[PDB]
């Protein structure tokens, strides 16, 4: 009934781009949404990684000295594109540092020492569901779950489950009040997204967001919570992906899609 009430031609975008895109946005004020192949699955590449730290924080409410714990790793444990956590190889980091590394710096090294914290991918799973999550999925470890590998469901998730996690975690009560605002925090100081959905947001008004990247098969994406002023929080999901592995990924389409969703919901920008 509040969805897709104005079509937008998502359709001719992700033809020009060659693949396939993927989009659920939310306006949480009125519940109306816009949706795009929102149910199909796509890698989530780094995606994930900003639903690691959201498990760390909850991990957190009941274990008041984690975000503190220093961390000491080995050079065996940095895993290319590690660009904080190299940094303090000497030295450690908190768990709380790891998490903002992993986040806003998409870390690798930093999100492998996480998910070993949390049970590994099985763990992280685990608190998807928690949250009544059913569709998200981790298999596999950086960087093997990059491979992006048409039809395997490892790894994935939907762009509407994407979203509505990410509503629970940072609007919702699926993390306590301080734990919620350190996630939007964190989110609101990712650096690797200026060129995908905080494209599309005018500079005037907050955004938190998560790149992912796979590398291959055109596969990269972002999820984003956006505070447009005067009005209800947006929550947005786009993903992308296309048939040959050396199809190459664009920033410009992730940001496209984003304009899309919010003039498709109405909202000025």
Not at 100 to 126: C, F, I, M, W
Request: with cysteine; proline share 5%.
């Amino acid at each position: 009934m509040l969805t897709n009430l104005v079509a937008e031609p998502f359709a001719k975008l992700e033809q020009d781009f060659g693949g396939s895109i993927g989009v659920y946005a939310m306006d949480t004020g009125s519940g109306a949404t816009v949706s795009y192949r929102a149910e199909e699955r796509f890698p989530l590449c780094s995606s994930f990684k900003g639903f690691l730290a959201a498990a760390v924080l909850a991990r957190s409410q009941q274990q008041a000295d984690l975000l503190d714990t220093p961390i000491r790793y080995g050079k065996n444990a940095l895993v290319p594109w590690s660009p904080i956590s190299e940094k303090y190889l000497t030295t450690g980091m908190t768990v709380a540092e790891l998490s903002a590394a992993a986040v806003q710096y998409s870390d690798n090294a930093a999100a492998n020492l996480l998910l070993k914290e949390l049970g590994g991918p099985a763990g992280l799973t685990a608190f998807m569901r928690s949250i009544g999550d059913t569709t998200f999925r981790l298999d596999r470890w950086e960087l093997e779950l990059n491979s992006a590998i048409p039809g395997d469901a490892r790894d994935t998730s939907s762009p509407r489950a994407v979203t509505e996690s990410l509503q629970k975690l940072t609007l919702g009560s699926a993390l306590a009040a301080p734990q919620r605002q350190q996630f939007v925090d964190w989110l609101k100081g990712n650096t690797t997204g200026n060129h995908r959905i905080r494209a599309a947001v005018p500079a005037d008004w907050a955004v938190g967001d998560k790149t992912g990247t796979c590398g291959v098969y055109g596969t990269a994406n972002d999820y984003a919570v956006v505070w447009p002023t005067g009005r209800a929080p947006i929550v947005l999901a786009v993903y992308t992906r296309a048939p040959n592995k050396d199809d190459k990924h664009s920033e410009a389409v992730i940001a496209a899609a984003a304009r899309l969703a919010l003039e498709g919901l109405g909202v000025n920008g």
